[PDB]
Amino acid sequence: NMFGQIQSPGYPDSYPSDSEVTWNITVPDGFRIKLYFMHFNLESSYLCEYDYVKVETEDQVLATFCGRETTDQTPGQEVVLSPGSFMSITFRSDFSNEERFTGFDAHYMAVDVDECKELSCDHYCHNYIGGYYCSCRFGYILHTDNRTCRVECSDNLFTQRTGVITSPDFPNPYPKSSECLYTIELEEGFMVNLQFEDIFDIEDHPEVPCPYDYIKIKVGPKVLGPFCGEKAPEPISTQSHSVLILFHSDNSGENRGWRLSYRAA
Amino acid sequence: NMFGQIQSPGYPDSYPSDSEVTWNITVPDGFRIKLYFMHFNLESSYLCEYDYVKVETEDQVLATFCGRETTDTEQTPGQEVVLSPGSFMSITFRSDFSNEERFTGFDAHYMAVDVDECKELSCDHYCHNYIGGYYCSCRFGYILHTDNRTCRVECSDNLFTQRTGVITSPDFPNPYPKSSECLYTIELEEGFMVNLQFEDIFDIEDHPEVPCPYDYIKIKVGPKVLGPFCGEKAPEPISTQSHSVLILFHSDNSGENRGWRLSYRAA
Ligand SMILES: *[C@@H]1O[C@H](CO)[C@@H](O)[C@H](O)[C@H]1NC(C)=O
Ligand SMILES: [Ca+2]
Ligand SMILES: [Ca+2]
Ligand SMILES: [Ca+2]
Ligand SMILES: [Ca+2]
Ligand SMILES: [Ca+2]
Ligand SMILES: [Ca+2]
């Protein structure tokens, strides 16, 4: 079902009267139908109510043709493309073909849908015949949704008296679908003070507290947050030599993220 | 296997030294292979002699890449697509013994691409392309021959009974249909004798050495066949002693010759 030919009854002779033939064309998923004509010779009438070639889908009429390609409503060299993978064609003939119209000769074929051109791929889209797939930029990992591109952002440990911690690629949009664990572990006796600076931009919601992306900060047996939005939390003075910062990002958005510096009190 | 992805060993980490991997890609008949790269980071060398990605067929090297996409004036693939001539593509990544610098290799993607045979022993009239193949069809009034390629006609449904008349090759003086077999029959009453006379253009494919090996006219009168006739020069007028004559016109699968016209008169 990648291709086919269709003719009116009797072709290349004049078609009979009182005839009605329907052809249903189905192609696999990821394909559309292309239809064109090499010969078209029908009765010409007002809005093709008498004799006609009707091209339609299951819920939509794509085209209706009648008349003669010579001096007339005809398809001409025009291609009829279906929106999806289905096309129905009906040739109808009324009660009298006294002029001996010779009908039509048509050809159809499956055409690949280019999904990349038509929940899209986060980074790269790759089209192929019958489908498509997504891939990611260097340094990113395709998520389990087969669509978004996450990163590994947990392989860290901050042990020095002062330091800087940011969302991945800050201040460029942070990676979607990621789960970053930043760990501060200073020397016993040191107490960590946290301080946000620069751009702060974490996707939020006007009514619901941080339903999408957020920072949580665990110090001792207690979690601070979640934090999101355009306004950073106020500086945080812990009484702890160790702090965990968890940054969660969902499958959507282009927010720029956050930066913090830490210092021992 | 209409598509696939290929990476260097270790990707996205630096590739190991002394490694050699070949990927053979075969697609069905009527398809070609399209190959492109999303990341390319190799050692650079003269003719890519050290580290390289070599793209080839069974008898032809299509491309050889090396170097890093960052630095320019290089032998990297860039955004360029590599297209195989046929339905086979072989790819070899080679890394020599010297990997001082830590190059991260490559990320490649390939897919089958339909050959458009109509664009790229061809259809006489219409060619129709589809995914994985193609077919021919004919103009209105013609019939696709058993070769699935040339377009013949029915040209034998005739009978000339009038005292005078005109007979021509089909569509004269436009090119006559290939692969056809026309039978023209003149039948007059007993005692009439048919004279034949060619006129206007006469153009039947011929050969300089061999008598009419391609197309020809034969004319049967009584128990005798005249001809075969072909070429650019019509036979001289033919006076039969017969009230009935058969003209056979044969055309082969090739050529665009304009044909012939004759008038007849029953004496
Ligand atoms: C003509 O077409 C048929 C299919 O319709 C094909 O199988 C057959 O082999 C073709 N003839 C030649 C000589 O290829
Ligand atoms: Ca009618
Ligand atoms: Ca596709
Ligand atoms: Ca988000
Ligand atoms: Ca090397
Ligand atoms: Ca094709
Ligand atoms: Ca010829």
Side-chain angles (χ1 to χ4, degrees):
Chain A
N1 65 338
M2 292 290 91
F3 72 99
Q5 298 185 232
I6 293 167
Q7 310 170 348
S8 50
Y11 186 95
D13 292 302
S14 68
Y15 56 79
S17 64
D18 299 338
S19 72
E20 187 176 352
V21 189
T22 295
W23 296 273
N24 288 348
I25 306 167
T26 301
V27 293
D29 293 342
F31 296 94
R32 281 189 189 112
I33 319 269
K34 192 172 86 180
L35 175 74
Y36 58 93
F37 298 78
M38 305 310 303
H39 189 264
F40 196 95
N41 198 245
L42 264 74
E43 184 184 2
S44 189
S45 56
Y46 175 67
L47 301 179
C48 304
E49 55 185 14
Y50 299 158
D51 298 357
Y52 63 81
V53 172
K54 187 182 190 175
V55 181
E56 69 196 324
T57 69
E58 46 280 280
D59 59 4
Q60 175 184 338
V61 176
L62 304 174
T64 308
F65 300 116
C66 64
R68 67 181 79 98
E69 49 198 337
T70 287
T71 318
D72 280 326
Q73 291 177 316
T74 56
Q77 315 276 228
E78 292 293 341
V79 165
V80 182
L81 189 65
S82 69
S85 67
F86 174 78
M87 186 185 281
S88 187
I89 300 168
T90 296
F91 166 76
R92 189 237 173 181
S93 181
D94 72 348
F95 82 112
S96 65
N97 194 191
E98 301 164 72
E99 287 74 53
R100 313 180 210 171
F101 299 101
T102 53
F104 74 94
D105 175 33
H107 296 77
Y108 70 86
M109 85 214 45
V111 177
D112 177 55
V113 171
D114 189 340
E115 292 93 347
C116 303
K117 303 297 202 55
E118 269 78 328
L119 301 178
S120 48
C121 300
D122 188 8
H123 292 174
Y124 303 121
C125 185
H126 307 269
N127 187 47
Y128 64 85
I129 296 172
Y132 77 99
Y133 66 91
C134 308
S135 80
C136 299
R137 298 185 216 129
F138 180 84
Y140 287 81
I141 300 163
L142 193 65
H143 188 52
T144 42
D145 56 13
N146 292 324
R147 187 168 57 80
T148 62
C149 297
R150 66 168 190 87
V151 297
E152 283 307 328
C153 42
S154 298
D155 285 5
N156 62 72
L157 180 63
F158 299 81
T159 60
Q160 286 180 332
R161 183 187 136 253
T162 63
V164 178
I165 310 187
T166 79
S167 48
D169 213 11
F170 178 87
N172 301 293
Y174 52 80
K176 300 178 183 63
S177 306
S178 296
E179 186 168 70
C180 309
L181 302 166
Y182 307 93
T183 309
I184 303 171
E185 193 207 313
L186 300 191
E187 253 173 302
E188 156 73 4
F190 279 27
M191 289 175 266
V192 175
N193 290 168
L194 300 172
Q195 172 156 41
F196 287 90
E197 54 197 15
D198 213 307
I199 289 141
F200 190 90
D201 177 17
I202 303 187
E203 196 189 0
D204 70 351
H205 190 274
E207 333 281 340
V208 178
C210 309
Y212 308 127
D213 306 338
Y214 55 82
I215 293 178
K216 289 169 169 180
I217 301 178
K218 182 168 185 185
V219 29
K222 188 194 179 191
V223 181
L224 303 169
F227 302 115
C228 59
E230 296 159 54
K231 184 96 168 59
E234 300 295 308
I236 295 163
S237 300
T238 76
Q239 307 297 112
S240 187
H241 58 83
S242 62
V243 175
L244 170 74
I245 302 144
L246 178 150
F247 179 49
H248 180 268
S249 66
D250 72 356
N251 70 0
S252 178
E254 306 297 339
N255 306 263
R256 303 182 75 170
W258 54 268
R259 167 182 164 127
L260 69 79
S261 63
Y262 74 81
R263 295 181 48 85
Chain B
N1 191 62
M2 294 283 89
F3 72 98
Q5 300 185 231
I6 293 166
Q7 309 170 349
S8 50
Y11 186 95
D13 293 301
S14 68
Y15 56 78
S17 62
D18 183 35
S19 71
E20 188 175 351
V21 189
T22 294
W23 296 273
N24 288 349
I25 306 167
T26 302
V27 294
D29 293 342
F31 296 93
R32 276 176 188 140
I33 319 269
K34 193 172 85 179
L35 175 73
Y36 59 92
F37 298 78
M38 304 312 301
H39 189 264
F40 196 95
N41 197 244
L42 264 74
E43 186 188 3
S44 189
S45 72
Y46 171 74
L47 292 184
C48 298
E49 58 184 12
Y50 299 159
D51 297 357
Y52 62 81
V53 171
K54 187 182 191 173
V55 181
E56 69 196 324
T57 69
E58 46 280 279
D59 60 5
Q60 175 183 340
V61 176
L62 303 175
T64 307
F65 300 115
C66 59
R68 68 180 78 98
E69 50 199 334
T70 329
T71 314
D72 214 26
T73 315
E74 287 277 334
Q75 339 185 226
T76 57
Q79 314 277 229
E80 292 293 343
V81 165
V82 180
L83 189 66
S84 70
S87 68
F88 173 79
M89 184 184 279
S90 187
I91 300 168
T92 296
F93 166 77
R94 187 237 175 181
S95 181
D96 61 358
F97 296 81
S98 188
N99 213 17
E100 301 271 44
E101 303 187 38
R102 260 30 182 81
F103 300 101
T104 53
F106 74 94
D107 175 34
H109 296 77
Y110 70 86
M111 85 212 47
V113 178
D114 178 55
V115 171
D116 189 339
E117 293 92 348
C118 303
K119 304 297 202 54
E120 321 168 27
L121 307 171
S122 62
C123 302
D124 190 6
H125 291 174
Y126 304 120
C127 185
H128 307 269
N129 187 46
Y130 65 85
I131 298 171
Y134 77 100
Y135 66 91
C136 309
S137 82
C138 300
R139 296 186 219 128
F140 180 83
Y142 289 78
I143 300 162
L144 194 65
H145 189 51
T146 45
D147 58 12
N148 292 323
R149 188 171 55 83
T150 59
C151 299
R152 68 168 190 85
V153 296
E154 283 306 331
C155 43
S156 296
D157 285 5
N158 61 71
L159 180 63
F160 298 84
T161 60
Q162 288 166 328
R163 280 259 218 146
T164 70
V166 178
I167 309 187
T168 77
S169 54
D171 213 11
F172 178 88
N174 301 293
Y176 53 80
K178 299 176 184 64
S179 302
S180 296
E181 186 170 68
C182 308
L183 301 168
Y184 307 94
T185 310
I186 304 170
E187 290 252 14
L188 314 174
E189 171 193 358
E190 187 67 341
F192 284 115
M193 287 171 21
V194 180
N195 302 340
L196 301 172
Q197 173 156 38
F198 287 87
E199 52 200 24
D200 302 332
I201 287 159
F202 189 90
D203 178 15
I204 305 187
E205 195 188 359
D206 70 355
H207 191 273
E209 332 280 341
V210 177
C212 310
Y214 307 127
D215 311 334
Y216 56 84
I217 294 178
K218 284 167 172 186
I219 301 176
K220 181 166 186 187
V221 29
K224 192 194 174 186
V225 181
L226 303 169
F229 301 115
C230 58
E232 296 161 51
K233 183 99 167 60
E236 302 295 309
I238 295 164
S239 301
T240 78
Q241 307 296 112
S242 187
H243 58 81
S244 64
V245 175
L246 171 74
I247 301 148
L248 179 149
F249 180 48
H250 180 269
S251 69
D252 72 0
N253 70 2
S254 178
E256 307 294 337
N257 308 264
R258 303 182 76 170
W260 54 269
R261 163 185 168 124
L262 68 80
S263 63
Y264 76 82
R265 290 165 183 74

